[PDB]
């Protein structure tokens, strides 16, 4: 089915065109709040902003802006929060967002250092005995354990609100070898990572939406979410071969600009869904 549709696109070589078409048709919505001058230093990139209508609001009287978007797939019945790699000044906001939205998992698809440049702040503690305190938002963050594998790491974190002294376990799924504007090592590597995120229960509706980020939070994040949603739909529907990837991607881009950043990432998302389908049957 989709494999046939996949065979065709590859032969013609129209991936760059199929991709450029999705870009032409992608929704365009105002980003007034993100562009306010008082928020310049809360954005990592000037060409990547959350739409006003889908943005996450911090529950803070001071300034409620964070560069994060709620992506609500109503048919697949799954929500995601896509956001940028936190800045040195927005780490408190990031974890406040995680607390307020009752998220159970955080999916990170970039590395803190890429090509000698800092694409992301060290927003979680690297050592069990060096916990992080965020003074502005009154949150404490402790590394509980980590399990390192060749291409991804799974960390267990404890998030505590210093005001209430509630504590929550946050799972941190970190794909460590996915380069900006590139693709994972293989469909199998991606599918194993996604299936571990799934098996943890972090995408279950009993929790708030999982937080997914990269450096900008659109390219690698879109590849991850597109594949996860398409596989969800194929299980739900009585006609699995029906699911149209480009329609799902365009539905996702109503909530955040730029999801999936290269034609190869788009191609890779098809591959991951095709290969991933064999496990769902």
């Amino acid at each position: 089915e989709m494999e046939k549709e996949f065979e065709q696109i590859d032969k013609s070589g129209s991936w760059a065109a199929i991709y450029q078409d999705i870009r032409h048709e992608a929704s365009d919505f105002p980003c007034r709040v993100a562009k306010l001058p008082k928020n310049k230093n809360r954005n990592r990139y000037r060409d990547v902003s959350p739409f006003d209508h889908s943005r996450i609001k911090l529950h803070q009287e001071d300034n409620d802006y964070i560069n994060a978007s709620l992506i609500k797939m109503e048919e697949a019945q799954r929500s995601y929060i896509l956001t940028q790699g936190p800045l040195p000044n927005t780490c408190g906001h990031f974890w406040e967002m995680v607390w307020e939205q009752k998220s159970r998992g955080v999916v990170m698809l970039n590395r803190v250092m890429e090509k000698g440049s800092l694409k992301c702040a060290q927003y979680w503690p690297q050592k069990e005995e060096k916990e992080m305190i965020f003074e502005d938002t009154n949150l404490k963050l402790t590394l509980i354990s980590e399990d390192i594998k060749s291409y991804y790491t799974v960390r267990q974190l404890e998030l505590e609100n210093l005001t209430t002294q509630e504590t929550r376990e946050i799972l941190h799924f970190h794909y460590t070898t996915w380069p900006a504007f590139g693709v994972p090592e293989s469909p199998a590597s991606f599918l194993n990572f996604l299936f571990k995120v799934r098996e943890s229960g972090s995408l279950s509706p009993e929790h708030g939406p999982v937080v997914v980020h990269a450096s900008a939070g659109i390219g690698r994040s879109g590849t991850f979410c597109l594949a996860d949603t398409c596989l969800l739909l194929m299980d739900k529907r009585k006609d699995p071969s029906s699911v149209d990837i480009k329609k799902v991607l365009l539905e996702m881009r109503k909530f955040r600009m730029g999801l999936i950043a290269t034609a190869d990432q788009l191609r890779f998302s098809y591959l991951a869904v095709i290969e991933g389908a064999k496990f769902i049957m």
Binding site: R44, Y45, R46, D47, V48, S215, A216, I218, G258, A261
Partner: peptide, 5 residues
């Protein structure tokens, strides 16, 4: 200061 290019 921009993601693209």
């Amino acid at each position: 200061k921009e993601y693209y290019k």
